[PDB]
Ligand SMILES: O=C(O)[C@H](Cc1ccccc1)Oc1ccc(-c2ccccc2)cc1
């Protein structure tokens with residue numbers, strides 16, 4: 354039933370657009386900067402970082418880690434809004450909604466971060482700035498280990514050349530994964546996901562004449578994301594046990610884990 | 614040894630001032646607004662909230678809860694910086710530093726929030742605005758329950774009339790509490806705290822001729838703070854189990870608890 358699968362595709366796209374201010378279209382407009390309006394400021398050394406403070410909405414590694422922490426609090430609200438717009442979702446068991454969002458959230462953060470990334474760096478500060486990969490690599494040891502797996506993921510992911518209409522569906526599919534630990538009622542989740550998968554396959558055929566095997570490749574990427582989440586959690590766990598400077602400890606995370 | 618206890622008092626005061634941008638002196642200057650420069654905008658109904666968006670750095674209840682979430686990520690860094698400045702602290706076992714900060718942090722957030730509060734409301738947005746207690750009480754049910762215990766604590770706490778020099782020591786004493794669960798080496802912590810307690814008693818005698826029993830009253834307040842943290846955690850735990858709107862779930866907290 355393809356009228357329905359198309360209507361669902363559009364519905365997903367319109368909520369994505371409402372929920373997520375910084376889209377792939379916006380990010381690529383800057384990176385393909387014909388639109389010189391927002392030609393981004395390039396932070397490529399300590400010098401240009403220092404100059405860039407007087408023209409962006411801002412130990413450099415600590416700043417960056419806290420930047421990630423702040424971004425997570427914002428991203429959760431965006432993702433939660435979008436999740437609620439997925440037909441069927443708010444009708445699920447309250448505990449399953451929680452479970453699905455809990456595991457979906459970081460997988461989606463990295464999916465969307467890739468929109469801002471290429472092999473040379475990442476857009477920062479609502480696209481105002483471009484921070485160089487080699488600049489990041491030159492910083493304090495833990496920073497680099499954190500970013501490089503994400504870059505590597507993003508280079509392979511971006512070579513699939515998805516647009517925002519593609520991403521809306523992919524992201525919904527991720528949320529509606531019926532194999533999350535602790536799920537109570539798996540069949541209704543699988544039902545919604547099966548229908549989302551068909552909507553995704555059809556969308557990819559329509560939007561991509563320049564490639565085949567895009568659907569399969571994309572489903573492999575949902576597995577890769579689970580690995581990236583896991584490596585990330587584990588780097589943080591090494592820091593928690595071994596880092597001697599308390600300002601480099603996550604810590605808010607250690608508090609919510611143990612006290613809350 | 615009172616030259617030392619005074620030098621320590623000053624050392625603590627200077628780091629407090631470096632670590633914490635918004636002080637009690639600043640907050641009281643606004644609330645005793647002879648300095649009309651920053652006479653705060655009063656959000657006292659929905660109408661004045663709506664007008665106040667066009668003159669402050671900003672469902673209203675969700676905005677407020679996320680505001681608290683953002684503030685926590687900022688506060689942890691301030692508090693960690695200050696903790697490191699307390700003589701003896703960075704020489705403790707790494708695990709004990711972690712433990713002390715983990716339990717100290719929320720107790721200090723509420724201690725300092727009181728600086729912004731009176732029985733009629735709370736300073737918001739770096740003191741730019743004053744949000745009314747009765748306005749908060751009129752909002753969505755969970756909001757009110759969250760704030761009222763903090764107001765009640767803050768009214769009794771503020772009636773002790775401490776200044777920033779007093780607070781610096783009190784806060785250090787809190788961090789250096791030797792009864793936190795999981796501490797490895799308790800005696801060195803107790804040693805530093807005993808000396809901080811003397812510095813605190815002497816400070817209070819010198820700074821407060823208009824009251825006696827201030828030291829005792831203040832130590833009772835360290836126990837009260839533990840209750841406020843506990844009630845807070847428990848309200849969040851009720852929301853996690855019973856709230857049907859996912860946008861009203863903490864959730865970042867649920868993710869760090871279960872996945873990290
Ligand atoms: O785990 C998370 O929620 C975020 C996820 C994220 C990763 C990259 C961009 C945006 C978000 O990653 C973090 C990385 C480092 C830290 C952190 C913060 C302070 C001190 C040390 C590490 C916190 C979160």
Ligand SMILES: O=C(O)[C@H](Cc1ccccc1)Oc1ccc(-c2ccccc2)cc1
Pocket residue numbers: 678679680681682684685722726860861862863864
């Ligand atoms: O627990 C915390 O870290 C903060 C503590 C805090 C409380 C008042 C002012 C500043 C900080 O309190 C929160 C209160 C509500 C929420 C929250 C966020 C989103 C959805 C529901 C609740 C998060 C934190």
